[PDB]
Write a protein that binds this ligand. Structure first.
Ligand SMILES: O=C(N[C@@H]1CNCCC[C@H]1OC(=O)c1cc(O)c(C(=O)c2c(O)cccc2C(=O)O)c(O)c1)c1ccc(O)cc1
Length: 339
């Protein structure tokens, strides 16, 4: 615990430095052969890309300046990169290069062949308490890191965790994220995983991450999410209500932990109370976990996804690909002077 501090202490330092003065550009579209599409979103897509001279594959995040600005997400967009190249953490994706053009914003990160966990999760059906424990183990440290730097992630779901080659998850998508002190008020998020602070609209905080951890662990472990309904509106009724019904197969330690994570009252809710992180980290259910060995990836992962070779893409769903257009006359080049 003399241990914990220092680490972060410095941890912070890095961060701010690389947040004050961050790198502009550092590559150009055409040094990469585009291979296939990994995911989509409202204004871009990720793509497997192979480094022209240095075979290294990478995932490349390409955003349509226009579609963006075309709906103030401008702020979000820049944060994403901002943060992304600022942080450093074994469970955080590595941003390899960023650059822009007359049309798009680009982010080329590391390629984690394992794919998403949404898959794995849905493929296997449910995770053994241990398997779950292992993951959770890692989210926790990350948040503990994330919240150190006044960051509140806000976008915790299975689709945002990539199963590295080694069984270790990797968090991606800092879009929704935000760096603040005190409460924030934006309704960012996916029903199934929203603290109730948010819903009721009051001014949430880092807390909201821990609760998501509950629904995550819960989900990772029951095969479904705690609060689930057909229409977002019915889900709000329960989230908010706190009607958590656990499946018999839940250890009791486990069932205990959620009792807390899924604590509708933030002054009661874990990760938030006086001893903070320590409450969770401690709580029995984590007895077996050697935090340090994990943070350093010593542990033998429950599961290691199969990977055929350099560039393998099996673990990712199939998307309809379209070529990358790069207009011949800069677009909204003002609005993205910082990126
Ligand atoms: O994150 C990946 N794929 C992501 C997975 N997460 C959840 C859903 C699938 C997919 O989504 C995207 O590719 C993606 C596409 C987008 O257009 C955007 C955005 O445009 C976007 C944004 O960039 C910032 C804020 C909001 C959005 C948005 O789409 O609403 C995004 O954040 C993710 C991924 C990351 C690294 C890697 O080596 C392999 C894959």
């Amino acid at each position: 615990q003399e241990s914990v501090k220092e680490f972060l202490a410095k941890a912070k330092e890095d961060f701010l430095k690389k947040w004050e003065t961050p790198s502009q550009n550092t590559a150009q579209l055409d040094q990469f052969d585009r291979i296939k599409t990994l995911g989509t979103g409202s204004f871009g897509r990720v793509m497997l890309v192979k480094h022209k001279e240095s075979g290294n594959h990478y995932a490349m995040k390409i955003l349509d300046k226009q579609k963006v600005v075309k709906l103030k997400q401008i702020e979000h967009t820049l944060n994403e990169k901002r943060i992304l190249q600022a942080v450093n953490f074994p469970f955080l994706v590595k941003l390899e290069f960023s650059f822009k053009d007359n049309s798009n914003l680009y982010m080329v990160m590391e390629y984690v062949a394992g794919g998403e966990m949404f898959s794995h999760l849905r493929r296997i059906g449910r995770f053994s308490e241990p398997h779950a424990r292992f993951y959770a183990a890692q989210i926790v440290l990350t948040f503990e890191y994330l919240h150190s730097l006044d960051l509140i992630y806000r976008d915790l779901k299975p689709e945002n965790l990539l199963i590295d080659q080694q069984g270790y998850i990797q968090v991606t998508d800092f879009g929704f994220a935000k760096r603040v002190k005190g409460r924030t008020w934006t309704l960012c998020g996916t029903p199934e995983y929203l603290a109730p602070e948010i819903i009721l609209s009051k001014g949430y905080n880092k807390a909201v991450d821990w609760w998501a951890l509950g629904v995550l662990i819960y989900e990772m472990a029951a095969g479904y999410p705690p609060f689930f309904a057909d229409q977002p509106i019915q889900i709000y009724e329960k989230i908010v209500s706190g009607k958590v019904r656990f499946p018999s197969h839940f250890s009791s330690d486990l069932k205990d932990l959620l009792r807390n994570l899924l604590q509708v009252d933030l002054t009661k809710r874990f990760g938030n109370l006086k001893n903070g992180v320590n409450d969770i980290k401690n709580h029995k259910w984590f007895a077996t976990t050697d935090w340090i060995a994990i943070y350093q990836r010593k542990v033998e992962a429950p599961f290691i996804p199969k990977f055929k070779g350099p560039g393998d893409t099996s673990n990712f769903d199939d998307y309809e690909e379209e070529e990358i257009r790069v207009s011949i006359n800069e677009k909204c080049g003002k609005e993205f002077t910082e990126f």
